[PDB]
Amino acid sequence: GSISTAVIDAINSGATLKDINAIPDDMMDDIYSYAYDFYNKGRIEEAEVFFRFLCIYDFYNVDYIMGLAAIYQIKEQFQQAADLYAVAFALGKNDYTPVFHTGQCQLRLKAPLKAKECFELVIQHSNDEKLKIKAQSYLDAI
């Protein structure tokens, strides 16, 4: 998956496609918009390939990671989604949406204590009042 590719790239330390600027920003933006065109039409499998492609080229990109994590969550691949949401948070530390969605995933993974920690973080640190209500609704059910 995306995470194992990132680790292999790091182990081998050899030149990556991004290291040589193999794909311009403008083309990456286009491919990202095509990925959502597929996603928005319900073509989830093609969207997944396109987000995997983006995450091979530029793994450390919150927008690409969040798109792939959403697909895994929809596909009920909850651990893969949770792992990617955590990468996104590490790279975009001021947005608690990935923490909220990780909480949902942990609930489906039968890890209510991990889910509780996620929803509590949202309520303590997010300034998104609507996201906080949603997190509290989950907490109320735990």
Ligand X SMILES: Cc1cccc(C(=O)NN)c1
CA angle 13, 16, 19 (to 5 degrees): 105
Q: Which two tokens stand for residue 31?
A: 């491919």
Query: Judged by CB under 8 A, does residue 3 bind a copy of itself?
Result: no
Query: Judged by CB under 8 A, does residue 56 bind a copy of itself?
Result: yes
- Residue range at the interface with Cl ion (CB under 5 A); choices 10-18, 45-53, 54-62, 91-99: 91-99
Residues of 65-90 as b/e, b for ≥16 C-beta within 10 angstroms? bbbbbbbbbeeebbebbbbbbbbbbe
Q: Out of Cl ion, a copy of itself, ligand X, none, which partner does residue 50 contact, by CB within 5 to 8 A per kind?
A: a copy of itself
CB of 131 vs ligand X, minimal distance in Å: 14
Among the listed residues 101, 95, 27, the one whose alpha carbon sits nearest the alpha carbon of residue 58: 27
Could you give the 3-state DSSP secondary structure of residue 96? coil
Interface mask toward a copy of itself for 8-27; x: CB under 8 A: x--------x----xxx--x
Interface mask toward Cl ion for 122-141; x: CB under 5 A: ----x-x-------------
H helix intervals, the chain: 2-12, 25-40, 44-57, 62-74, 78-91, 97-108, 112-125, 129-141
Q: Out of ligand X, Cl ion, a copy of itself, none, which partner does residue 31 contact, by CB within 5 to 8 A per kind?
A: a copy of itself
Residues forming contacts to Cl ion in the complex (CB under 5 A) are: 77, 79-80, 96, 111, 113-114, 126, 128
